[PDB]
Subunit: 341 residues, 3 copies
């Protein structure tokens, strides 16, 4: 007994960008783009066998499958082999980062990738990812459960396996959760002595074009709220920081940014209207306040549940990035459809 | 309840090309190539759930799967999410073009890709394709059923989303069918104010190497015939046309070509012998009759049905393209096997 | 009735290479690499339908699926369509080479690809592969069974289909087996009048960078042993040879190498400890003894069977290649997990 599952979701999204810099049209406004777009359809195959005592062997293979036909490859979404039992769970493979899992309580919007940032809290989710790694998940001991994860230096860099000439990009991810009477609160974070970021502050493979090496990269997230009684309100606080490691005397200088997000919604019969606010404060790059990284976003919308596996979706979102003249404003809205199986 | 399906088909095909131009061997003849070749194996996953009233949510993910191992990717064959009910059907995703669907009644031959043109009416099928799009399919109202399809400018060109600096390649596909007492007749066509063609007259993505931009591109197909009583006879008429839009004073000049095809077959117990004839008339390119596009093809063959899902196949085909000295003649024959699941 | 199956296997492997030449660290020693690594997870879809008499139609689509997410594509592992019945079996598609099948009795170790050579008898398995081809498998006529396989010139080279200007790389693979009272002994080999090798002596596509064309390439394998009674002992002997066909007066000169391998193991309840020894003799390249191709390897390890589909794995291996100063020594060990479904 092996099981097949997935999700299928598509919809048409509408958007426009207000950017003085790369738009020469009147007043910096882009035209308005109207597109049909897959929202991240997926399809997996998980299974489990009982081992005799409390133990169960477990595995999963999940792939991006976009109904627009733009994906390819196996196990490119969470996939793994593991063992489960008294002690809790132990998994190894392409694994959701403890911070990516905590992303559920923080960004629940559906959208195409060209809009993950305006129609979803994509900016705060920029720290989430999947990593080849080992992960331990503790049982829920009465309100509490815990997760510890680790990524090998030689899995975080494969070419450098035999010559340790590049500093380790091995990282540690760990989380602590608490659920009770609708109440929940969790802490999740990650730390890597050495890592590399692109200019959007997302982590990238060592040696990617224009990656900026960093030291002591750490991320902290804290979410809390209440989910039950046709009711949900969630508040998240995130803190990112690292030192400059790139060649040339900027090295040692501090990078850091703080984001906060809040979302609440209620189910009124089959409709669940929702709303989210998110803010990214000014950032300190190489020790200097850089207002290019500051932003504001609010998203509103609802889902009409045709059934427990099928929903109709709608949302509009607004985003403001940076300040003054380098200002970038994005506005989008969509209507789609999701079917879980 | 989600269902798995597909088809598997392979066979060995034999071929030779008579082309004075790119063959220096005696008299323009190529050697004779003998190959094992996948005929387009595929594998999908479709599903549906009832929604409460006459409505049903529907989806599919179908992928090219060639047993020779040369394919990769998900949803690269018709895949989609849709809703079905009283009003008929509504789908969105990688969708068979209304003209690709009408291809069933017009080219039913199985073959490898290196022979889609001699062992199949591939030339008349050059107007068929799949497009990210929305599609409506009307219920059969007593003999009649109808289909309307549309491809967004921003799905027909994604890079140009925000700068509308390139003319829309958005297109409309629509069909009308009629079935009764074995009798059927359908019209199917498509129209795009702006499109782009390669030299084989097939549509290509804006900006492909050597694509020729065109204006008012329209295709018309008409098929009619009789399928029942161990009996099938089909006749198709197709008309393609467009204006020249490419840079440089050839612009505005007319392109056009007409093709006709005919196929008939009968089931004598488990064998179904079949035969097809197809003709492409001289073409008018930039206002001038170009006999390079004219051709003649006849295909004969049969299928021995081992069971309702398994068949053995055989066919020979002959094709003549262009005239005089630029003449290209292709001849092939194959024997294969197909298994539907 | 179509069936889904596969295997999932991952584990962490540890390794170090002692190579004076490409390591400048003290004494030629590399650092020690510690990696999580997929061992070749896979997932297939096979099926069969009865045809009425003793005959059954059969098919399979099997894909590399690595839980680390590094694979993509369909049918890239054995996949095919075939017919089975009184006469035995007939298959066509991506097919395991008769010599790749005989690989079961000769290399049974699990490992990641970066260690297929030290943690597995990978070196002797260098002659195994999959080829688009047709294959016949005779029924077992009381102890004996047989296999004959063939790869078309036009499937072994596709570009050269119409101009036969390159000599045929078409090859023949054939095997003969015998099983009885735990006893078994098989012969398996292949022969190609023209082929091409890389410097590791593995076969490569015509025209690959740095491939060395060869004439009369033939491989001979012979394995024998006893598997039953919680008992296994296997001995293999292999002989490879070819003539030089590359441009420039080295042509016509003899290449040849001999390898032998031996492995035995016993099941003591759920544990099955195992051990293997393998040796590659000096090689004759262009008529000259080349000790660069000579090697020695011993692998020890066991599998603890959690159940008939789940095992825990462990192994260490040691390998010595070439002689004197060009000497390359590899040592690795791993612990992993496998789950068949
Ligand atoms: N690599 C990525 N880059 C950008 N966005 C992503 C990436 N991976 C996932 N996402 C988005 O973030 C979401 C993460 O998954 P989620 O929303 O929890 O649904 P899911 O993956 O089907 N369920 P789960 O298994 O719990 O993750 C996806 O729906 C994507 O829209
Ligand atoms: N992109 C393409 N280019 C060239 N030939 C194609 C392409 N797509 C499909 N074909 C061929 O045309 C046929 C179209 O599908 P068809 O013959 O109807 O079988 P099917 O796809 O299994 N069923 P359906 O879902 O009704 O299309 C395929 O069998 C292919 O041989
Ligand atoms: N192309 C390849 N290159 C290198 N190693 C390979 C290749 N293909 C397979 N292998 C390895 O050799 C083994 C061949 O398959 P095998 O060990 O018999 O397991 P299997 O493929 O699941 N079963 P079978 O269908 O009998 O081959 C795989 O487990 C791989 O580890």
């Amino acid at each position: 007994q092996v099981t097949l599952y997935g999700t299928i979701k598509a919809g048409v999204e509408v958007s426009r960008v207000k950017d003085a810099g790369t738009y020469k049209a009147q007043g910096g406004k882009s035209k308005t783009a109207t597109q049909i777009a897959d929202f991240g359809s997926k399809i997996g195959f998980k299974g489990q066998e009982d081992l005799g005592n409390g133990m169960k062997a477990i595995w999963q293979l999940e792939q991006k499958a976009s109904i627009a036909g733009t994906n390819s490859g196996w196990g490119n979404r969470q996939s793994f082999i593991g063992l489960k039992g008294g002690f809790g769970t132990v998994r190894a493979g392409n694994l959701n980062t403890v911070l990516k899992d905590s992303g559920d309580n923080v960004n629940a919007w559906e959208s195409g990738s060209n809009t993950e940032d305006v129609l979803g809290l994509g900016t705060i989710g920029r720290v989430e990812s999947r990593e080849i790694s080992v992960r331990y998940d503790s049982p829920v001991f009465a309100g509490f459960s815990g997760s510890v994860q680790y990524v090998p230096r030689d899995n975080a860099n494969d070419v450098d396996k035999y010559k340790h000439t590049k500093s380790s990009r091995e990282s540690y991810h760990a989380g602590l959760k608490y659920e009770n009477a609708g109440f929940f609160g969790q802490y999740a974070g990650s730390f890597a002595k050495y890592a590399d970021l692109n200019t959007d502050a997302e982590r990238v493979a060592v040696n990617t074009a224009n990656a900026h090496p960093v030291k002591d990269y750490q991320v902290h997230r804290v979410v809390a709220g209440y989910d039950a009684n046709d009711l949900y309100v969630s508040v998240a606080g995130q803190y990112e920081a690292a030192k400059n490691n790139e060649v040339g005397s900027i090295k040692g200088k501090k990078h850091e940014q703080t984001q906060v997000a809040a979302t609440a919604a209620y189910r009124f019969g089959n409709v669940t209207p929702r709303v989210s606010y998110a803010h990214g404060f000014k950032a300190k790059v190489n020790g200097v306040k850089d207002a290019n990284y500051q932003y504001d976003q609010v998203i509103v919308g609802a889902d009409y549940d045709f059934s427990k596996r099928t929903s109709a979706l709608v949302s509009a979102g607004w985003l403001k990035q940076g300040k003054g003249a380098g200002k970038v404003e994005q506005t989008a809205s969509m209507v789609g459809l999701r079917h879980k199986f």
